[PDB]
Amino acid sequence: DDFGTHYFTSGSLGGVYDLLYQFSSEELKNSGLTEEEAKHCVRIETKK
Amino acid sequence: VFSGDGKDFYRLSGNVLSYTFQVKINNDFNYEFYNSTWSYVKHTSTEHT
Ligand SMILES: *[C@@H]1O[C@H](CO)[C@@H](O)[C@H](O)[C@H]1NC(C)=O
């Protein structure tokens, strides 16, 4: 446990790195329009 | 101890078993951005004659 089971006879030594990125985006639009117009008129006339 | 990613030299001891010169660094990031917008408009007009 202190010294191990194997030892390095031949090999390599160098550097390495890694990068991971995650991006998300959401866009939502909503519009509403409601128009109502009403006009009513009456006229009566009588003469005798 | 040989100079690895540090000063000119370093001295170890018998009780110390090992010294390492392997520089490994990690990082993590979690950035967020949002926006919630509301717009309600109402109008009315009544005329009687
Ligand atoms: C609305 O969202 C955009 C998105 O980047 C942000 O830049 C802006 O500051 C927000 N406006 C607010 C929350 O009033």
Q: Can you tell me the distance from the alpha carbon of B21 to that of B5, in angstroms, rounded to the nearest whole number?
A: 6
Q: Look at residues A19, A16, A23, A24 and name the one whose alpha carbon lies nearest to residue B28.
A: A19
Q: Look at residues B36, B47, B39 and name the one whose alpha carbon lies nearest to residue A33.
A: B39
Tokens of A1: 């446990």
Distance of CA B2 to the CA centre of its chain: 34
CB B21 within 8 A of CB B4: yes
Q: Specify the residue with its C-alpha closest to ligand 1, atom 6.
A: B35
Residues contacting ligand 1 via CB (< 6 Å): B 33, 35
Tell me the structure's resolution in angstroms, rounded to a single decimal: 5.6
Q: Specify the residue with its C-alpha closest to ligand 1, atom 9.
A: B35
Approach to solving: cryo-EM
